């Protein structure tokens, strides 16, 4: 690799100059790249989204964990390496999800609504509870899922989860394979989605899962919107099949103003910012540095998609 | 002790019939007591606040941790024992405070405000941060303080604290005496107040403390309102001497509708519910069972004030 181009699209997550400056001692020059740039041998590119121009480069680094919007087959045939940013979002997302769960347990969102009205409104006696002793089911036990798990466990929660192998995971009391999803979620106060969007995960959580879930339970989606059937979620909320939801991701983003999801008291909408951090530039830069080292020494790239 | 009277004032915290039912099989009858009840030898009374009528009873158990609204000198003179409920609020308050801090770090309150407007409003890049690596100073290292410390530590925060003895406390890196309060707070992102209201603590946090505090810092008050000079807090928030506050307790409660505190975006107001729990009746009943035994056997009462 002779050059790192920083595609302007990284601006969707972080100021590009902040990222460029973070990489000033990388060992190769780092340059801002506009949307109408050509690439060639020796070029690495960091980007938010895909461009066909990137196929001429040696290596593209996607600055997101999710790569479901990249044409993986087309990279494979063009001989371009593709990496993602999995592994850097566990603290941010884990903290946000702890925040969602504590908001629901302690009723912080309801108090915030009352604050706007200058209203000293006491909760119903049965409403406030502690996370300590409550059960969370974490679906997907990778970086995001483990970040959630570790914080839930530290807060005294009973933690169960779902992963491909069904094999044990640190801080998870019971791990289920994906075919036992209904057993995994049935007794949970919170169900947290942390899987990639795949053929297999699309529409995973729909009306039947909402039926299975406790009426006092809340869904947390920090994965991708289409893991949930969004219309079924609306119907479940309306019907009281579940109590509420904390949603960072949606089938359409920005979430249209006409979505019924905005108006539910016990829904939290966040605008795809559960992983937001003022140091994102540093966190992504560390990945770039790691792979530049691996390229230099001829080892296998970290987070290689194709 | 021949009778446990449950004062109607317990309804300020929990439904009285739920508490009475939780006190079944004490070995003595449990009776509801209205505001004109007379007391006498053999009576224990569980109450939220003080009545002079209680000075004819053997023992009053205050159902709150804080007892600053009880005329302690007068109980001594009358020979009536007084106990409080310290020791049972660490999980509830600890969780609420973790929730406040996560709310600020992850910008959840801003997203909630936007949700009312169906607005997909992105934070400025610098706004979202992680609690991991940030410093919290906890002032008062008792049940509440330690419940805060333990959760802060578990979330990866740097934790310092203030106590009189300056003796070390588990999960606190550095303990300061109160004459070093300004050293303790100077570098903290969050300053949490968890002391009783006493002659010593009244007005502890005022203009000089707000000057000392970082401009990006937030005050959390879960103690009593008058530990803070409220007018100085308002001035500090107006001037930007600190960034914000999470406030559960106030110099006047309910907080008057025309308090300036309601209107600050980076203030969270909660209506003295940081310790709220749907099992409060069980938690207090356990303490009463404990102290009935202590009286029966002639041992020193738990949480004896006078
Ligand atoms: N909201 C955000 O800002 C944000 C940030 C980062 C990631 N994400 C989303 O979260 C996803 C996961 O990110 P990550 O960094 O944890 O990825 P990861 O690869 O570390 O973990 C994903 C885990 O899900 C597992 N998995 C796959 N299919 C599954 C199934 N059917 N059932 C249960 N588990 C399954 C994988 O084996 C893996 O262990 C990303 O693909 C992305 O869509 C969202
Ligand atoms: N917001 C709520 O719902 C809620 C709930 C419970 C308690 N409280 C308030 O919090 C206070 C503390 O409750 P707790 O259960 O932690 O009490 P506690 O007795 O367990 O702890 C109080 C701590 O403050 C320390 N302290 C006393 N005076 C001090 C001083 N001058 N400087 C520094 N430290 C001092 C004590 O030594 C003790 O460690 C109560 O008195 C009450 O006012 C509020
Ligand atoms: Mg309600
Ligand atoms: Mg609990
Ligand atoms: Mg299904
Ligand atoms: Mg259901
Ligand atoms: Mg409901
Ligand atoms: Mg703003
Ligand atoms: Mg941090
Ligand atoms: Mg203790
Ligand atoms: Mg002072
Ligand atoms: Mg200041
Ligand atoms: Mg005050
Ligand atoms: Mg300011
Ligand atoms: Mg207002």
Author numbering:
A (entry chain B), B (entry chain A): 3 to 308
Wording from the paper:
Interestingly, the structures of the D2HDH complexes determined in this study have shown that, dependent upon the crystallisation conditions used, the 2-ketoacid substrate can be trapped in the crystal structure in two different orientations, representing a catalytic or abortive mode of binding. In both the productive and abortive modes of substrate binding the 2-ketohexanoic acid alkyl side chain occupies a similar position in the active site, but is twisted as a result of a 120° rotation to the C2-C3 torsion angle. In this structure the ketoacid was also bound in the abortive orientation, showing that the difference was independent of the nature of the co-factor.
Here we describe the molecular basis of the reaction mechanism and dual NADH/NADPH-specificity of D2HDH, a 2-hydroxyacid dehydrogenase from the extreme halophile Haloferax mediterranei, an organism whose proteins have to remain active in high intracellular concentrations of KCl. Sequence analysis has identified D2HDH as a member of the DDH clade of the D-isomer specific 2-hydroxyacid dehydrogenase enzyme family (2HADH), which has potential applications in the synthesis of chiral fine chemicals including alcohols, and hydroxy or amino acids from ketones or ketoacids. Structural studies have shown that all members of this family share a common fold based on two domains, which cycle between open and closed conformational states that serve to close the inter-domain cleft, bringing the substrates together during catalysis. The D2HDH dimer has an overall ellipsoidal appearance in which each monomer is folded into two domains (d1; residues 1–92 and 283–308 and d2; residues 93–282).
